[PDB]
Design a binder for this molecule. Structure first.
Ligand SMILES: O=C(CN1CCC[C@H](NS(=O)(=O)c2ccc3cc(Cl)ccc3c2)C1=O)N1C[C@@H]2C[C@H](C1)c1cccc(=O)n1C2
Ligand SMILES: [Ca+2]
Ligand code: NA
Lengths: 56, 233
């Protein structure tokens, strides 16, 4: 018997990066160097060379 | 790296290379920040005094965005064990800050729980370095990268003559002749998630290179996330 995928288990809870469930809802956070967007899902780089991006 | 592809311009910006007194590459590292490299503990035993090269893609030419940094502090994990390579991890603090540019940038550190459920459950990660292209060959002069499948711990342990501890994981191919190799030690295992690359492992050891029924063994970075953060304070 396999659980139905919901919350953070469903497409990373629609977060760009870190997803945790708190108070029974999805909460998104970002690595250092990013700030959470107004939609509270996307992470925006705050400077020129943010971590984990290829320099293309 | 045995197999895999050459690292193209800007594709592995977080690669670092440890160089000896003779300016030779002997181990890999990962860029964590302006001041900090991640590598393998056992790499420290390989050279008397060493330095850190970044932005390097071709040992024979001058990359241009290439730079050498000196080590101020070496923080070896106090539990590292020569007999098992458990806790094979160290952090380097540089004397001067790294300049981020084309081919020089840090990898992201994930959070532990999210890393375990999301990153570590992807099909594959990428490993890279300037190590041998064959088990008995010379160091590479070109940076290479190789997509390596995650291996389940069962298959991993069964295939292993030695103890795979909780601080390690397996990645690679049962038969396909691609793997990390001597000289890739200390280098990046990163996992892509939604166009962002996170540090997941440190090149540790293997029984040979790309041998049939064997795998590459990596330090599980998720197990040291807290420590790594302590280190940078
Ligand atoms: O096997 C090893 C270390 N080791 C020995 C020689 C072959 C190989 N060198 S390699 O081919 O250059 C090499 C090095 C790193 C690699 C990383 C990846 Cl991802 C894949 C393949 C790799 C191959 C290697 O890693 N250990 C397992 C146990 C406990 C520790 C660590 C230990 C220490 C000393 C001796 C010994 O026998 N053992 C046995
Ligand atoms: Ca070069
Ligand atoms: Na193999």
């Amino acid at each position: 018997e396999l659980f139905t995928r919901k919350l953070c288990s469903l497409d990373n809870g629609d977060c760009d990066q870190f997803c945790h469930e708190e108070q029974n809802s999805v909460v998104c956070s970002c690595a250092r160097g990013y700030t959470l967007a107004d939609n509270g899902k996307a992470c925006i780089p705050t400077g020129p060379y943010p971590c984990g991006k290829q320099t293309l | 790296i045995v197999g895999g592809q050459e690292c193209k311009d800007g594709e592995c910006p977080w690669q670092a290379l440890l160089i000896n007194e003779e300016n030779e590459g002997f181990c890999g590292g990962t860029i964590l920040s302006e001041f900090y490299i991640l590598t393998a503990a056992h790499c420290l035993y390989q050279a008397k005094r060493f330095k850190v090269r970044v932005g390097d893609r071709n040992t024979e030419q001058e990359e241009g965005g290439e730079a050498v940094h000196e080590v101020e502090v070496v923080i070896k994990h106090n539990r590292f064990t020569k007999e098992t390579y458990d806790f094979d991890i160290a952090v380097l603090r540089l004397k001067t800050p790294i300049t981020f540019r084309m081919n020089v940038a840090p990898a992201c550190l994930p959070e532990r729980d999210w890393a375990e459920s999301t990153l570590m459950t992807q099909k594959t990660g990428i490993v890279s370095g300037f190590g041998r292209t064959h088990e008995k060959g010379r160091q590479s002069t070109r940076l290479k990268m190789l997509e390596v499948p995650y291996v389940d711990r069962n298959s991993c342990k069964l295939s292993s003559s030695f103890i795979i501890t909780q601080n390690m994981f397996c990645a690679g191919y049962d038969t396909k002749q691609e793997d990390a190799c001597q000289g890739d030690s200390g280098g990046p295992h990163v996992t892509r998630f939604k166009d962002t690359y996170f540090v997941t492992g440190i090149v540790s050891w293997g029984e040979g290179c790309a041998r049939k029924g064997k795998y590459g063994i990596y330090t599980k970075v998720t197990a040291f996330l807290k420590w790594i953060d302590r280190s940078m304070k």
